[PDB]
Design an enzyme around this catalytic site. Structure first.
Site, PDB file in Angstrom:
ATOM      1  N   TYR A 473      -7.734 -11.555 -63.567  1.00 19.56           N
ATOM      2  CA  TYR A 473      -6.331 -11.542 -63.160  1.00 19.56           C
ATOM      3  C   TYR A 473      -5.556 -11.993 -64.413  1.00 19.56           C
ATOM      4  O   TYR A 473      -5.002 -11.158 -65.120  1.00 19.56           O
ATOM      5  CB  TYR A 473      -6.099 -12.473 -61.964  1.00 19.56           C
ATOM      6  CG  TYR A 473      -4.685 -12.469 -61.432  1.00 19.56           C
ATOM      7  CD1 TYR A 473      -4.199 -11.396 -60.667  1.00 19.56           C
ATOM      8  CD2 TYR A 473      -3.845 -13.551 -61.660  1.00 19.56           C
ATOM      9  CE1 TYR A 473      -2.883 -11.410 -60.159  1.00 19.56           C
ATOM     10  CE2 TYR A 473      -2.550 -13.580 -61.161  1.00 19.56           C
ATOM     11  CZ  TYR A 473      -2.079 -12.521 -60.407  1.00 19.56           C
ATOM     12  OH  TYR A 473      -0.802 -12.599 -59.908  1.00 19.56           O
ATOM     13  N   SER A 554      -2.506  -6.159 -59.134  1.00 21.72           N
ATOM     14  CA  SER A 554      -1.182  -6.724 -59.419  1.00 21.72           C
ATOM     15  C   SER A 554      -1.144  -7.030 -60.923  1.00 21.72           C
ATOM     16  O   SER A 554      -1.300  -6.120 -61.738  1.00 21.72           O
ATOM     17  CB  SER A 554      -0.937  -7.969 -58.551  1.00 21.72           C
ATOM     18  OG  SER A 554       0.452  -8.260 -58.437  1.00 21.72           O
ATOM     19  N   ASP A 641       4.297  -0.742 -50.738  1.00 25.61           N
ATOM     20  CA  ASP A 641       4.098  -1.871 -51.628  1.00 25.61           C
ATOM     21  C   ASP A 641       5.434  -2.188 -52.275  1.00 25.61           C
ATOM     22  O   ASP A 641       5.777  -1.660 -53.351  1.00 25.61           O
ATOM     23  CB  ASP A 641       3.074  -1.595 -52.720  1.00 25.61           C
ATOM     24  CG  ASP A 641       2.782  -2.832 -53.557  1.00 25.61           C
ATOM     25  OD1 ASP A 641       3.542  -3.838 -53.482  1.00 25.61           O
ATOM     26  OD2 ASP A 641       1.766  -2.814 -54.267  1.00 25.61           O
TER      27      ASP A 641
END
Length: 710
Positions: A473, A554, A641
């Protein structure tokens, strides 16, 4: 292998914008409009080639069947008490949404309190936030449809689970806090806006306000308690102190762990809550974080990172508020991060630390901050907890890479504390003893040692023959800790893979310094860190370039997309979920403006200079060497989204297909799958989770031609 043709996609060559003297062409800017016939046709054409590709090999069906079997295990959340009753979430195994249960005692028969499954045929309506009144007799809950961040708050009377008429609209990124008099609840809402507000729009969210809803009235009657007209990006969340005397307002702007902290002594209001409250601006800047733990009269205990990157506990006395007077209750640790703190049984504090990416849990005295008890845990994460000030017991939920987890209980009224296993479920078909988790630290480009967890079958030879699945991430102070994933374990057991999770900079693993090490001018550190993790797995023999798959969602989608552009030679497959790809325009949509504290903003010349170098959408370029092409890539997004608007992925795939897909040497597929009735991911029904993982692993299996191991 490729037996399809990429869709015709119009290039607006007139779309030219000047960024501080730097001309930038955006030929697919038209994909920014989700409602146009052109954009709808684009999505249709893309799904038309992606779906048959994913469903061609029977391995998808084998994976789906195994996922359906293994994911089918009882899933319980941490028990929690409200008023005289206990509550917990539970999913029998494959229900689309977990169900909230209630029982009048720990030995009492439980009954369904709130079942989201009956709210939709496909389980696309999910709970998003909730708050019980102080006495536990009333319950407010948010509902999001199709994965959107938008929320509609509804109410129930606990006794008898009676539906109330109260409904609150225009709610988003909202707090939910009842005043202790039981009269009403604080929440946040956004002003009405032109166009839709269902998650398919891209409209920027500004001017969030704090309102108070009196139970039994229409929303039109709600009281405006706080607003920031001159600061459109400010968001103020409310919470009541443990004693119900004060409303604490935490104002945030951006995503850094910092907040202004204002308070309102409710007793000092002239005639109850009737409008803008008499806020006292205790902390009126964004220099540090102040997370309320508890208070004893005017002495407030807060978890802060003010001149303490690894966090600590301080006591601020409202009657002697100057910083030089604050008392340090639990000093900052030299390396371990104090993740969160809770106050329970009046004078106990439960502290959760992150030691080299593994959780520890301990009990301290509220008066002195002294350590009293260490709650023993295996290597993993604490993912659930219950125990408020008036409670006399705590529940805490643990999980790790190899086992679903354990729910522990501890009666704090006992002289000698004896924590016990309250619940424990094991998945039949996945023998944990057949695998092992190892933690290694590898040097990045600049020499910084980065932690990495590697999960694999015991006894494997490090000869580079194994497919690997590397996850990362890297950003927003989020720490990527051990978690149980049946989907990844199926990759290990049935596809003979090695799982790896790299704790790269930008994350919160080593506090705010770790966070700052992967943001703004130093965002490249994240990419370098991740590329070095791949290099480590390769050098040490866990895998090889042609067998390596990288994944992230993301900010992690940005991670893997950028890595594909920078080092296409290092990866065989890349799966980017709901990623931010247009780094020059991300701030223009929905809540994108909040991310500038991690990324910067293209409006600034200095920031533009950092952004342009790694922005996925602006760095697609054919590899120079003839024997090098782009890895197989799969972008996954959804039409609702509204966290990371789908245009990011739409524009990115159009670019990859045009610049790279048309090249004669490119034989690896560059695909996108845009799902319906779904969003960023939170609240996704089980049915959809299963389809998604089946797609991801079928893609990996086909691209790398991996055989299924029964």
């Amino acid at each position: 292998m490729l037996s399809f043709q990429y869709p015709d996609v119009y290039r607006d060559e007139t779309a030219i914008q000047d960024y501080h003297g730097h001309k930038v062409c955006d030929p697919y800017a038209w994909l920014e409009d989700p409602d146009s016939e052109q954009t709808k046709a684009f999505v249709e054409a893309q799904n038309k080639i992606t779906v048959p590709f994913l469903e061609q090999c029977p391995i998808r069906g084998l994976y789906k069947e195994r996922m359906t079997e293994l994911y089918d295990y009882p899933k319980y959340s941490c028990h929690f008490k409200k008023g005289k009753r206990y509550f917990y979430f539970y999913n029998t195994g494959l229900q689309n949404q977990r169900v909230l249960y209630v029982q009048d005692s720990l030995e009492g028969e439980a009954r369904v309190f709130l079942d989201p499954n009956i709210l939709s045929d496909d389980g696309t309506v999910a709970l998003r936030g909730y708050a019980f009144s102080e006495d536990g007799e009333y319950f407010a809950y948010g509902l999001s449809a199709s994965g959107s961040d938008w929320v509609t708050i509804k109410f129930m009377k606990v006794d008898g689970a009676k539906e109330l008429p109260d409904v609150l609209e225009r709610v988003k990124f909202s707090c939910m806090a009842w005043t202790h008099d039981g009269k009403g609840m604080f929440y946040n809402a956004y002003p009405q806006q032109d166009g839709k507000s269902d998650g398919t729009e891209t409209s920027t969210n500004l001017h969030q306000k704090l309102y108070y809803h009196v139970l039994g009235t229409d929303q039109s009657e709600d009281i405006l308690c706080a607003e920031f007209p001159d600061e459109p990006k400010w968001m103020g969340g409310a919470e009541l102190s443990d004693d119900g005397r004060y409303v604490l307002l935490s104002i945030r702007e951006g995503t850094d762990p910092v907040n202004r902290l204002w308070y309102c002594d409710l007793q000092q209001e002239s005639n109850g809550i009737t409008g803008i409250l008499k806020w006292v601006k205790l902390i009126d800047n964004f220099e540090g974080e102040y997370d309320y733990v508890t208070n004893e009269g005017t002495v407030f205990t807060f978890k802060t990172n003010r001149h303490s990157p690894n966090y600590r506990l301080i006591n601020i006395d409202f009657t002697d508020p100057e910083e030089s007077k604050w008392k340090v209750l639990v000093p900052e640790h030299e390396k371990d991060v104090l993740e969160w703190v809770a106050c329970v049984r009046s004078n106990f504090l439960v502290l959760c630390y992150l030691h080299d990416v593994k959780n520890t849990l301990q009990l301290h005295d509220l008066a002195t901050g002294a350590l009293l008890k260490i709650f023993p845990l295996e290597v993993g994460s604490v993912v659930g907890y219950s125990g408020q000030k008036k409670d006399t017991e705590i529940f805490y939920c643990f999980t790790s890479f190899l086992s679903p987890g354990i729910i522990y209980h501890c009666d704090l009224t006992k002289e000698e504390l004896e924590p016990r296993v309250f619940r424990e479920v094991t998945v039949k078909g996945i023998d944990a003893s057949d695998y092992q988790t190892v933690q290694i630290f590898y040097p990045s480009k600049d020499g910084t040692k980065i932690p990495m967890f590697i999960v694999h079958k015991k006894g494997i030879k490090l000869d580079g023959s194994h497919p690997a699945f590397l996850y990362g991430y890297g950003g927003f102070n989020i720490s990527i800790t051990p978690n149980y994933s049946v989907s990844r374990l199926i990759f290990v057991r049935h596809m003979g893979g090695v799982l790896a999770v790299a704790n790269i900079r930008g994350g919160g693993e080593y506090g705010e310094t770790w966070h700052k090490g992967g943001i703004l001018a130093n965002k490249q550190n994240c990419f370098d860190d991740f590329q070095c993790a791949a290099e480590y797995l390769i050098k040490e023999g866990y895998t090889s370039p042609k067998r390596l798959t990288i994944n992230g969602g993301s900010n992690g989608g940005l991670l893997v997309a950028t890595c594909a552009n920078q080092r296409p030679d290092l990866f065989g497959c890349v799966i980017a979920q709901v990623g931010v790809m247009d780094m020059l325009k991300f701030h223009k949509y929905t809540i994108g403006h909040a991310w500038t504290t991690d990324y910067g903003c293209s409006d600034s010349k200095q920031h533009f200079e950092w952004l342009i170098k790694y922005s996925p959408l602006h760095n697609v370029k054919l590899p120079e060497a003839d024997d090098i092409q782009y890895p197989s890539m799969l972008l996954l997004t959804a039409d609702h989204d509204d966290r990371v608007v789908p245009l990011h992925s739409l524009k990115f795939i159009a670019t990859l297909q045009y610049i790279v897909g048309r090249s004669r040497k490119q034989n690896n597929p560059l695909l996108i799958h845009v799902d319906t009735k779904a969003g960023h991911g939170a609240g996704m029904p089980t049915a959809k989770v299963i389809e998604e993982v089946s797609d991801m692993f079928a893609f990996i299996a086909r691209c790398l031609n991996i055989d299924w191991i029964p």
